[PDB]
């Protein structure tokens, strides 16, 4: 039961790291998201012109 | 049905079990190794803050994912011991 | 003319106001619920997509 | 204006959402299906590895 | 027709019988429910291949939740190739009226890399948004 | 009505008090309408409040003495809004200090420390340091001596509290009984053999026949002049198992593994 | 000049407002209006505090005022009048909008949508009173006007959540005015306050507005701790349905704090201890939270002493709070030593400092626990120990007295001993070898389930903002 | 302040202060709601007795308290217990809270008893006080004048009565287009909210009858009904109307819409019926 306890807890370590990692992925993707909005302004007008 | 049935261990495989010596070996091997995967993961995650994932994996040996490798080794023995207890106690309580 | 600071004209425009929370509670309850299910279905998709 | 003939604004939000909650039952149906898909895919991850 | 399907030894005849039962139990919804259960319960792939289509045509254009559930479960849960394919194509028939929901339901089946599944996923978008294009439908098919 | 009650207390008749109060309950309504209910307090309402307060007060002390603890609490409860508000304008009174002391003994004679400290907290904010503890000291010193666990101190305080003849003594006789009952849970854990003289000594008795009498009622089997605390424990444990709850109350070796298993595969 | 400074500030406010107003016009949302609102609230308060007084006046004049201009003006005359910035074209404008409250549209009166505007003018004024930091009449005027206005109409999901942040200021100004002075008429005004709080919660109950619901509960709890109505509050806490998944972390800390105080007074110190450590973790390390942390950490030291658990020496040193936690430190050394003589000194010396924190009510209960700890020392040091020996060390009065102290203490199982009357000693019974027994099994079972629950928190959080980013136009 | 006085008064056995106490407890009810919830079975004790005429007041405390405790269903029982004193609780700007839950409560019961038999408003399974509350809320929509809101709650609530009466009264010819508009809104919501076959056929069939009584009706409105239900009987009777008129253009128009829209099986029986009905051969 004690080995099972350490192992459940080992799996929890691994997952809290995977929790932080995807959270960094989101922090990164935020920059891209901001930049995209200013950029889409230019594209809309061109496609309507054609 | 003939094809499927390849066992007389359909009802004689859950109460049937391997000695506790062998379960002590699995427990001892499993705990001992996970330290080693855990020491590689510690060298590894001194990084994880530079440029490009693909580079980090080569240089500081992110290969095969040690994060994934520890999860697999923990999952296999974790699921196995629940069975080992689960069958153990089942026998004690039902048989006597 | 009339305001959303307070109600204006008692039991005329407060007669209209008077039949309003019966409609709005139903769907206000439905909004919060179906926003967390919508996020949840995508959560379990994400999970089976990595698998 | 905003509080005069308010019972006419009331009826169109009420109508529109009522139609969509039928269609929003088909999206929780999907949540239910993909709980099963991962269990079938976990035995097939096992079979593929096998 | 059902019983004759097991007697016949020519494969084409079973195929033809299985879907033609679907055609006869068209538009009948919940009265067709008893038949649906025998066709799915079988161990013959053709009876399942036709099984999917009986749900599709009886509950056709009404987004009945029970019908879509069977078709979903069966698609995934059978290893037999015809059986998989057929369940996917069936969805479009059911969700003909409410095609708003079709791309979000079938995103799943196109994620998976089994080919028969993927063949039927396309076809389901074909049927569902046949009437009028949906920009999303096109995007998933590219 | 009002004034007939006043002189009923002075006599030392407290049955006369109790008897005469149901009319005055009609007239307390007229009094409750006279105050606005503490929405605004003027000196008109200060005269009206005196009437109101008076009826409850003289009745409340009298309930004690006639062994009507229930009536006492009822009367006491009505005061509480008047005491809350309006401080140093007939809201903290000589009478307040006297009635709070007796209330605290009443909570204590239930042998609940839960209400007592909760009530104690309420008092910090009013009288407990304004007019000080000097009569409010009696339940607070008593509470002390049982929290540390000295029953000698409690016993002594209580013995001198029968010097205080009024209405504090109506609670003395309950509370001496309460020290015994408290001690009798303790002794199960402390001892498994006690002599007959020693059980008597410990529970503050002087009559052997009384010791053996209490034992029937407290469910102890004194057989041959030696108590068997252990018999008693057995019965007490068994009963708590006996009412259903019981598979998961116990927990099974098999059941733990089942719980853990389903969590991982969900 | 002076005008120019109010105009540059104003245009910042208008974008944030314009931005919320569109999201809520489409269909109400909770969190997305919320994120915008929280940034703006901070900035507005910093701009009003440092700069001008009539910078608030400017905005109120500029937009339609239902009564707000007159209400602002009353305030400004008392603390030094203002009549500037009343000019036209800063009052014939209704700022810039695409058409939602644009200068031509609002005059034309095809629309009039004072709703949200009403809500922002109330935030400006409510902050201004608190920035002034003056009490008296000024507090009272602030409560009167704003509360009945917000209650005549039924609020939308957006407006309701705004009004929770207004309510705070109301309680806080009123409460300090009451603690500064003793006026007999204020007690009667407190009853009116109590009534308003609970009605606000019931209105919000219907609309499922989760932040409003949580914020109100904290205030009501505070109000009980100040009035001594601990008695009522036992009732209150068993019927809460507090949100955790949709509220700010400041509320969640406050909530955890209150519980430990109320639980502790009812002589449950087990549950008290778990609740305070959670409040501390929610609450940051900054000097922005500094007075919160000081009080929370006072209560935690006292909790561990009430258990007989005792805090370590580590704690006080590694904190840099040494002077503040000095009465608790002396307490911790005192209880440990089992000195009744020291303890009498500690709570006497420090009396005032303790009572202000309202842990003094708890502290008196330790004069007893000082004794129980002390006799526990004795039974560890000496396994079998004469009744006489114990009486000698802690100045206890008879063999019979110490018998009785220990009888109470071992019902609570502190000492974990049993008295032999027939030999005359007190014998501890612990010898371990409890690994053999089923006790560790019980412990290991609990540990796993705290872990399985942590997996659940991880799963729900992780994947939910990913799902948003995909929907979003960004690739 | 505290409710502790009020408890004392019920616990007293002089009747006058108990009457009083019912009145006073309901004054401070949404402030001292937790305290008095603990000793709410007292309040109920007084309600059961038959020495009191202040039963309604006593019921009334509990309904307000029980909401705040968090059990919504229990509130509804005590409100219908009290009987009246609740038509001033729809016009409160602080309590419509009990009323809304009651409306929902009717729908749970109403679904169950529709499927069995169409009529069930002569049954005693639905409480009569509850029936009243539903009917007066709907009347309240029709007071400000909006039939869209009245139709919506009745449809959920499975009513034949309410829907029948709203369209009947909405024939009075104030604008022909306007009346026809309300009947479409009814056909649409029926398909899109309800797919339970029994109520859907019924509401739809009902609409056919009200359109045709009007001295002008759009027939696109009329045709929609026939094709969902697939009835040749509606179709036969529609034509027989135009055969009374002998009007060339109407007869050609409906027929073109029919052939496209309608299913093959329906048209095939229909032509045989018109042929023995008698028609100009042009339509055939």
UniProtKB/Swiss-Prot annotation, chain C:
Q: Where in the cell is it found?
A: Cytoplasm; Nucleus
Instruction: Please indicate which superkingdom the organism of origin belongs to.
Output: Eukaryota
Q: How is it modified after translation?
A: N-acetylated by NAT1.
N-acetylthreonine modified-residue sites: 2
Write out the function statement from the record.
The 26S proteasome is involved in the ATP-dependent degradation of ubiquitinated proteins. The regulatory (or ATPase) complex confers ATP dependency and substrate specificity to the 26S complex.
Other observations noted: Present with 4700 molecules/cell in log phase SD medium.
Concerning its family, UniProt says: Belongs to the AAA ATPase family.
Quaternary organization:
May form a homodimer or a heterodimer with a related family member. Interacts with OLA1, TMA17, and UBR1.
- Output this protein's name: 26S proteasome regulatory subunit 8 homolog
Q: What part of the full protein is here?
A: 1 to 51 of 405
Swiss-Prot record, chain D:
**Could you tell me where this protein is found in the cell?**
Cytoplasm; Nucleus
Give the source's domain of life in one word: Eukaryota
Describe how it is modified after translation: N-acetylated by NAT3.
Q: Give the protein's function.
A: The 26S proteasome is involved in the ATP-dependent degradation of ubiquitinated proteins. The regulatory (or ATPase) complex confers ATP dependency and substrate specificity to the 26S complex.
> In which family does this protein belong, per the annotation?
Belongs to the AAA ATPase family.
The protein's name: 26S proteasome regulatory subunit 6B homolog
Per the record, the gene is RPT3
Summarize which stretch of the complete protein this chain spans.
35 to 84 of 428
Swiss-Prot record, chain G:
Question: Has the keyword Acetylation been applied to this entry?
Answer: yes
Q: According to its record, what are the GO cellular component terms?
A: proteasome complex; proteasome regulatory particle, lid subcomplex
At the top level, the lineage of the source is Eukaryota
- Phosphoserine PTM positions read 437
Domain (PCI) spans: 253-433
- GO MF annotation, one: enzyme regulator activity
Q: Which GO terms describe its biological process?
A: proteasome-mediated ubiquitin-dependent protein catabolic process; regulation of protein catabolic process; ubiquitin-dependent protein catabolic process
- Report the function annotation for this chain: Acts as a regulatory subunit of the 26S proteasome which is involved in the ATP-dependent degradation of ubiquitinated proteins.
Q: Know the name of this protein?
A: 26S proteasome regulatory subunit RPN3
> To which species is this protein native?
Saccharomyces cerevisiae (strain ATCC 204508 / S288c)
Phylogenetic lineage: Eukaryota, Fungi, Dikarya, Ascomycota, Saccharomycotina
Q: Source gene?
A: RPN3
Curated annotation (Swiss-Prot), chain H:
TM regions (residue ranges): none
**Endpoints of the signal sequence:** none
Give the disulfide map.
none
Q: Which GO terms describe its cellular component?
A: nucleus; proteasome complex; proteasome regulatory particle, base subcomplex; proteasome storage granule
Q: Briefly state the modifications made to the protein after translation.
A: N-acetylated by NAT1.
Please give the superkingdom of this protein's source: Eukaryota
Q: Name one GO molecular function term.
A: ubiquitin protein ligase binding
One GO BP on record is: proteasome-mediated ubiquitin-dependent protein catabolic process
What functional role does this protein have? Acts as a regulatory subunit of the 26S proteasome which is involved in the ATP-dependent degradation of ubiquitinated proteins.
Task: Tell me the protein family, please.
Answer: Belongs to the proteasome subunit S1 family.
Task: Share any extra remarks.
Answer: Present with 4750 molecules/cell in log phase SD medium.
Q: What is the official name of this protein in its record?
A: 26S proteasome regulatory subunit RPN2
Organism source for this protein? Answer: Saccharomyces cerevisiae (strain ATCC 204508 / S288c) (Baker's yeast)
Report the gene name.
RPN2
- Counting on the full-length protein, the chain here runs from 4 to 287 of 945
């Amino acid at each position: 039961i004690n080995i099972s306890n350490n192992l459940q807890k080992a799996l929890t370590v691994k997952t809290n790291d995977e929790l932080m990692v995807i959270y960094i992925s989101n922090l990164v993707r935020s920059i891209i998201a901001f930049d995209d909005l200013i950029e889409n302004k230019i594209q809309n007008k061109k496609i309507q012109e054609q | 049905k003939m094809l499927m049935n390849l066992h007389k261990e359909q009802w004689q495989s859950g109460l049937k079990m391997y000695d506790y010596e062998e379960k002590e070996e699995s427990n001892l091997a499993a705990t001992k190794s996970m330290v080693k995967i855990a020491e590689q993961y510690s060298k590894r995650i001194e990084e994880e803050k530079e440029l490009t994932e693909e580079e980090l994996k080569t240089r500081y040996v992110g290969r095969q994912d040690p994060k994934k490798h520890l999860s697999e080794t923990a999952d296999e023995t974790l699921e196995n011991n629940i069975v080992s207890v689960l069958t153990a106690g089942v026998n004690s309580v039902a048989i006597k | 003319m009339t305001a959303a600071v307070t109600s204006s004209n008692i039991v005329l425009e407060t007669h209209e106001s008077g039949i309003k929370p019966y409609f709005e509670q139903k769907i206000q309850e439905t909004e919060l619920k179906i926003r967390s299910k919508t996020e949840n279905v995508r959560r379990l998709e994400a999970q089976r997509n990595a698998l | 204006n905003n509080n005069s003939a308010l019972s006419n604004v009331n009826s169109d939000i009420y109508f529109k959402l009522k139609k969509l909650e039928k269609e929003y039952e088909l999206l929780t149906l999907q949540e239910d299906y993909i709980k099963d898909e991962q269990r079938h895919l976990k035995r097939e991850l096992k079979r593929a590895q096998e | 027709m059902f019983t004759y399907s097991q007697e016949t030894q020519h494969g084409n005849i079973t195929r033809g019988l299985a879907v033609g039962l679907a055609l006869i139990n068209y538009g009948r919804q919940e009265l067709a429910d008893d038949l649906i259960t025998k066709m799915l319960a079988s161990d013959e792939s053709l009876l399942r291949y036709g099984g999917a289509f009986t749900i599709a045509l009886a509950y056709a254009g009404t987004g009945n939740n029970s019908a879509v559930k069977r078709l979903l479960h069966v698609a995934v849960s059978d290893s037999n190739d015809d059986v998989r394919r057929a369940a996917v194509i069936a969805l479009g028939f059911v969700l003909l009226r409410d095609y708003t929901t079709v791309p979000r339901i079938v995103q799943l089946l196109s994620k998976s890399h089994n080919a028969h599944v993927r063949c039927g996923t396309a076809f389901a978008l074909g049927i569902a948004c046949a009437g009028k294009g949906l920009q999303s439908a096109i995007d998933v098919l590219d | 009505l009002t004034k007939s009650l006043s002189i009923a207390f002075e006599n030392g008749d407290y049955a006369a008090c109790e008897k005469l109060l149901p009319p005055i309950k009609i007239e307390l309504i007229k009094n409750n309408l006279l105050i606005p209910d503490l929405s605004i307090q003027n000196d008109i309402y200060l005269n009206d409040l005196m009437i109101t307060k008076r009826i409850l007060e003289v009745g409340a002390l009298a309930s004690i003495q006639t062994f009507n603890f229930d009536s006492f609490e009822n009367y006491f409860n009505q005061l509480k809004p008047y005491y809350f508000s309006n401080n140093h304008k007939l809201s903290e009174s000589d009478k307040k200090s006297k009635l709070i002391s007796l209330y605290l003994l009443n909570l204590l004679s239930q042998n609940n420390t839960t209400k007592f400290h909760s009530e104690l907290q309420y008092l910090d904010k009013h009288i407990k340091n304004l007019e000080d503890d000097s009569l409010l000291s009696y339940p607070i010193k008593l509470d002390r001596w049982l929290m540390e666990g000295s029953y000698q101190k409690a016993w002594d305080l209580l013995q001198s509290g029968s010097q205080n003849i009024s209405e504090f003594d109506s609670f003395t006789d309950i509370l001496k009984s309460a020290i015994r009952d408290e001690i009798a849970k303790n002794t199960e854990l402390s001892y498994d053999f006690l002599p007959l003289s020693n059980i008597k000594a410990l529970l503050f008795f002087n009559n052997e026949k009384e010791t053996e009498k209490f034992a029937l009622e407290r469910n102890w089997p004194i057989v041959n002049s030696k108590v068997y605390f252990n018999n008693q424990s057995k019965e007490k444990a068994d009963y708590e198992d006996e009412m259903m709850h019981e598979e998961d109350q116990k927990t099974n070796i098999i059941e733990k593994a089942m719980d853990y298993a389903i969590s991982i595969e969900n | 000049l002076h005008h120019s400074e109010k105009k540059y500030a104003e245009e910042d406010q208008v974008q944030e407002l314009l931005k919320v107003l569109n999201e809520i016009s489409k269909t109400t949302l909770t969190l997305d209006p919320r994120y915008i609102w929280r940034s703006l609230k901070d900035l507005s308060s910093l701009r009003n505090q440092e700069l001008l007084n009539a910078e608030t006046l400017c905005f109120t004049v500029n937009v339609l005022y239902p009564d707000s201009s007159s209400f602002k003006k009353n305030l400004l005359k008392f603390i030094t009048s203002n009549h500037k910035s009343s000019v036209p074209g800063s009052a014939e404008l209704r700022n810039s909008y695409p058409a939602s409250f644009y200068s031509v549209n609002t005059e034309k009166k095809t629309i009039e949508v004072t709703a949200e505007i009403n809500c922002f003018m109330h935030l400006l004024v409510q902050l201004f009173l608190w920035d002034s930091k003056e009490l008296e009449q000024l507090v009272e005027f602030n409560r009167k006007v704003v509360i009945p206005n917000l209650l005549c109409y039924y609020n939308l999901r957006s407006l309701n959540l705004i009004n929770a942040k207004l309510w705070f200021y109301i309680y806080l100004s009123h409460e300090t005015l009451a603690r500064s002075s003793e006026e007999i008429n204020s007690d009667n005004q407190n009853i009116i306050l109590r009534s308003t709080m609970m009605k606000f919660l019931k209105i919000a109950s219907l609309k499922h507005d989760n932040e409003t619901k949580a914020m109100l509960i904290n205030l009501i709890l505070r109000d009980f701790l100040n009035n001594g109505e601990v008695d009522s509050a036992s009732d209150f806490i068993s019927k809460l349905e507090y949100p955790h998944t949709d509220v700010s972390s400041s509320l969640e800390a406050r909530y955890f704090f209150y519980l430990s105080k109320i639980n502790a007074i009812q002589l449950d110190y087990s549950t008290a201890n778990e609740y305070i450590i959670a409040a501390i973790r929610k609450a940051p390390h900054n000097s922005k939270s500094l007075g919160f942390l000081q009080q929370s950490n006072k209560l935690h030291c006292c909790i561990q002493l009430l258990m007989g658990d005792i805090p370590e020496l580590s704690f006080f040193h590694q904190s840099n709070m040494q002077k503040s936690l000095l009465p608790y430190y002396h307490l911790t050394k005192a209880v440990k030593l089992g000195d009744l003589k020291k303890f009498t000194s500690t709570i006497t010396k420090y009396k005032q400092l303790l009572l202000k924190d309202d842990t003094y009510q708890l502290c008196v209960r330790l004069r007893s626990n000082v004794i129980k700890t002390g006799i526990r020392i004795i039974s560890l040091t000496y396994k079998k120990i004469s009744l006489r020996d114990i009486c000698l060390k802690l100045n206890l009065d008879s063999e019979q007295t110490v018998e009785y102290m220990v009888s109470r203490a071992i019902r609570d199982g502190v000492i974990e001993a049993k008295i032999n009357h027939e030999d005359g000693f007190i014998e501890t019974t612990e010898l371990l070898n409890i690994y053999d027994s089923e006790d560790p099994q019980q412990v290991f079972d609990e540990r796993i389930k705290f872990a399985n629950q942590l997996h659940d928190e991880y799963l729900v959080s992780m994947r939910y903002p990913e799902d948003k980013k995909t929907q979003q136009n960004e690739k | 302040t505290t409710a502790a006085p009020l408890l004392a008064l019920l616990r007293e056995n002089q009747d006058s202060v108990k009457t009083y106490a019912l009145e006073s407890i309901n004054n401070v009810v949404d402030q001292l709601w937790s305290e008095i919830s603990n000793e709410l079975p007292d309040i109920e004790a007084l309600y059961d007795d038959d020495t009191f005429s202040d039963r309604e007041m006593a019921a009334l405390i509990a309904s307000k308290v029980y909401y705040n405790l968090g059990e919504y269903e229990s509130a509804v029982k005590y409100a219908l217990a009290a009987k009246d004193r609740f038509d001033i609780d729809e016009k409160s700007q602080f309590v419509e809270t009990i009323v809304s839950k009651s409306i929902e409560m009717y729908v749970q019961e109403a679904s169950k008893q529709y499927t069995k038999d169409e009529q069930f408003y002569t049954k005693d399974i639905i409480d009569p006080k509850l029936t009243s509350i539903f009917e007066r809320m709907i009347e309240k929509c029709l007071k400000a004048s909006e039939l869209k809101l009245a139709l919506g709650i009745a449809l959920e609530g499975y009513r034949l009565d309410i829907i029948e009466s709203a369209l009947k009264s909405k024939l009075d010819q104030d604008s022909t287009s306007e009346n026809v508009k309300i009947i479409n809104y009814l056909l649409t919501l029926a398909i899109t909210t309800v797919t339970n076959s029994k109520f859907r056929s019924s509401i739809l069939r009902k609409s056919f009858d009200f359109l045709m009584n009007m001295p002008n009706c759009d027939y696109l409105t009329l045709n929609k009904v026939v094709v969902n239900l697939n009835d040749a009987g509606l179709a036969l009777q529609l034509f027989k109307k135009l055969k009374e008129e002998n009007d060339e253009g109407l007869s050609a128009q409906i027929a073109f819409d029919l052939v496209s829209s309608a299913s093959q099986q329906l048209l095939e029986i229909l032509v045989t019926e018109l042929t023995a009905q008698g028609y100009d051969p042009a339509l055939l």
